[PDB]
Amino acid sequence: VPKVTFTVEKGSNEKHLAVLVKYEGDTMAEVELREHGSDEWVAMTKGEGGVWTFDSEEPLQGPFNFRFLTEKGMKNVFDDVVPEKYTIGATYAP
């Protein structure tokens, strides 16, 4: 199995993405998300169980790029891992 997987949780909708960011061997300290084609990185709220959501006041344009800081100081970037046509429950791994 991969080390970093991005699972789209139940409740996601066009104006509300909810992702289960897992990194075997570490924990997320903060996860930012940049929409497709924007140069802006928005912060994501730490929901619980390790789910980071984001409530956009406009719909969200995929594919999505995620960037995180782990509790161990690991800071990686992943461009486009959750496509525009993501299916819920589905796990996306680079």
3-state secondary structure the chain: CCCEEEEECCCCECCEEEEEEEECCCCEEEEEEECCCCCCCEECEECCCCEEEEECCCCCCCCEEEEEEECCCCEEEEEEEECCCCCCCCEECC
Count other Cβ atoms within 10 Å, centred on residue 88.
Answer: 12
Spatial distance between the Cα atoms of 12 and 72, rounded to a whole number of angstroms? 29
Pick the CATH number of 1-94 from 3.40.50.300, 3.40.462.20, 2.60.40.760, 3.40.50.970: 2.60.40.760
Cα end-to-end distance, the chain, whole Å: 11
Cis peptide before 59 (omega within 30 of 0): no
Spatial distance between the Cα atoms of 63 and 4, rounded to a whole number of angstroms? 17
Resolution (A): 3.0
